[PDB]
Amino acid sequence: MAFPSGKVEGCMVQVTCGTTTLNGLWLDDVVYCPRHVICTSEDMLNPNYEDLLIRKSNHNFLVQAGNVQLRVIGHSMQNCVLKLKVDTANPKTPKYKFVRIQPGQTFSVLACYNGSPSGVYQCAMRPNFTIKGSFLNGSCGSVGFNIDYDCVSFCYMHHMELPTGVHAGTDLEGNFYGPFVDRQT
Ligand SMILES: *[C@H](O)[C@H](C[C@@H]1CCNC1=O)NC(=O)[C@H](CC(C)C)NC(=O)OCc1ccccc1
């Protein structure tokens, strides 16, 4: 059984850089999202993320909370996630923590597209660090979480689909679960 999603729905935004759009997680005044948002389609083959990072400015990122655009005032990279500092703190930020889960553990996923929540379901982390998700194009940045009383424990951010149809992603510090890397290879 999935957890109720209301506390997490209020944290989802859309992030666009160039023609790449995915989802971000807005907590306090930081938006967390997968770093491959800064890739064009050609970059995705063998990205040099350090080089792409230098060439971006704050105004290259478009962050929207529904119809409201949020101004980006800084950005940094932490492992495989980008952290965009915005000028507005999310007034719906729940009590939360970032946790790294173990194979065998379950968590709920709020699947989102264009910054808008679409569905909620339960997943399990397999021994090879993959999950059998229901993720389509545009789902990157969707998060996995558990609820402990009133505290939302975020444990997964979605990045990619593997050839066999299963899914891989990172914790919220941007470290992959398993030996994968964020390149379309
Ligand atoms: C981000 O929205 C997207 C999610 C994928 C697309 C298909 N289903 C998903 O879960 N991720 C990517 O496009 C990712 C980007 C790299 C720079 C990591 N590449 C990826 O998952 O491989 C391309 C692919 C597309 C469709 C089916 C299988 C693989």
d(CA 177, CA 175): 7
Q: State whether residue 178 is helix, strand or coil.
A: coil
Cα dihedral value 171, 175, 179, 183, nearest 10: 100
Q: Exposed (0-12), middle (13-18) or buried (19+): which is 14, by Cβ within 10 Å?
A: buried
d(CA 164, CA 64): 33
- The helix or strand, by DSSP H or E, that contains position 85, with its residue range, turns out to be strand 81-86
Q: What resolution in Å is listed for this PDB structure?
A: 1.8
CA distances from 73 to 39, 43, 56 (A): 20, 25, 12
Structure method: X-ray
As given in the structure block, the two tokens for residue 33 are: 């999202």
Candidate from 140, 164, 170 with most ligand 1 atoms within 8 A of CB, to mutate:
140
Identified catalytic residue from 11, 17, 33, 36 = 36
158 is catalytic: no
Question: Judging by DSSP bridges, how do beta strands 72-78 and 81-86 pair with one another?
Answer: antiparallel
The upper half-sphere exposure of residue 45, i.e. CA atoms within 13 Å in the direction of its Cβ, equals 2
For residue 182, the ligand 1 atom closest to its alpha carbon is 18
Spatial contact of 81 and 27, defined as CB atoms under 8 Å apart? no
Spatial contact of 3 and 109, defined as CB atoms under 8 Å apart? no
For residue 139, the ligand 1 atom closest to its alpha carbon is 2
Cα dihedral value 63, 180, 177, 24, nearest 10: 10
22 CB near ligand 1 (under 6 Å): yes
As given in the structure block, the two tokens for residue 11 are: 């944290």
CA distances from 50 to 17, 71, 77, 79 (A): 16, 23, 9, 11
Q: Sign of dihedral through CA atoms 29, 34, 38, 40?
A: negative
How many other CB atoms are there within 10 angstroms of residue 59's CB atom? 8
Label residue 32 left, alpha or beta by phi (over 0 means left) and psi (-120 to 50 means alpha): beta
Closest CA to 79 of 23, 39, 34: 34
Q: State whether residue 9 is helix, strand or coil.
A: helix
Between the CA of 158 and the centroid of ligand 1 the distance, in Å, is: 9
